[PDB]
């Protein structure tokens, strides 16, 4: 990917930070894909997460190409969801949504899935040809038993707001999270090691 034009189709500071720290050079072009798919339409939550990442990356790829007639080399999409007792949780709409999510998660183990779509693009015959490679990573996370007081403490901080399931493992989310099991970068927002393995598959 060194001398290729790479587009990260995500406004997430946490995803950007992970890719930058890994040494990747990329431009940030957030997706306008605002349709959210029917969760019931997918056999698995990770199927849902991948398709969502694919659609965001394809939206960006086509939009860029339509704009200046330049096929971006690679467009990366990602979508992180939480599942607990069979329900998919995404980002909280407001603080009250956040509290409900965290109550649900309290004292339980849940899964975090990040679906990733790597889209290779080229232009031929006045159209964008896209080749999509799709993968996901699952990490299990355990919450300790949260009190009404801690719950509202964390909600009022605002930390829940930009995060799947309304929490993070990194800061004052540390008071909520008892343990993580698998790839921790996947929980932050991007499964870096899996991505790197995917690039090896695609280029070798």
Numbering used by the authors: 10 to 213
Wording from the paper:
Here, we show that the prokaryotic and eukaryotic Maf proteins exhibit nucleotide pyrophosphatase activity against 5-methyl-UTP, pseudo-UTP, 5-methyl-CTP, and 7-methyl-GTP, which represent the most abundant modified bases in all organisms, as well as against canonical nucleotides dTTP, UTP, and CTP. Thus, pyrophosphatase activity of Maf proteins toward canonical and modified nucleotides might provide the molecular mechanism for a dual role of these proteins in cell division arrest and house cleaning.
In many eukaryotic Maf proteins, including the human ASMTL, the N-terminal YhdE-like Maf domain is covalently fused to another domain encoding a predicted methyltransferase protein, whereas in some archaeal genomes (e.g., Staphylothermus marinus), the Maf gene is associated with a methyltransferase gene, suggesting a functional relationship between these proteins. In the ASMTL-Maf structure, two protomers form a dimer via the formation of a common large β sheet through the interaction between their β6 strands. This oligomeric state is consistent with the results of our gel-filtration analysis, which showed that ASMTL-Maf exists as a dimer in solution (observed molecular mass, 44.5 kDa; predicted monomer molecular mass, 28.3 kDa), whereas YhdE exists as a mixture of dimers and tetramers (observed molecular mass, 47.2 and 101 kDa, respectively; predicted monomer molecular mass, 24 kDa) and YceF as a mixture of monomers and dimers (observed molecular mass, 24.8 and 50 kDa, respectively; predicted molecular mass, 24.5 kDa). In ASMTL-Maf, the phosphate molecule is located close to the side chains of the conserved Ser19 (2.4 Å), Arg24 (2.6 Å), Lys65 (2.6 Å), and Lys100 (4.0 Å), and it probably mimics the position of the substrate γ-phosphate.
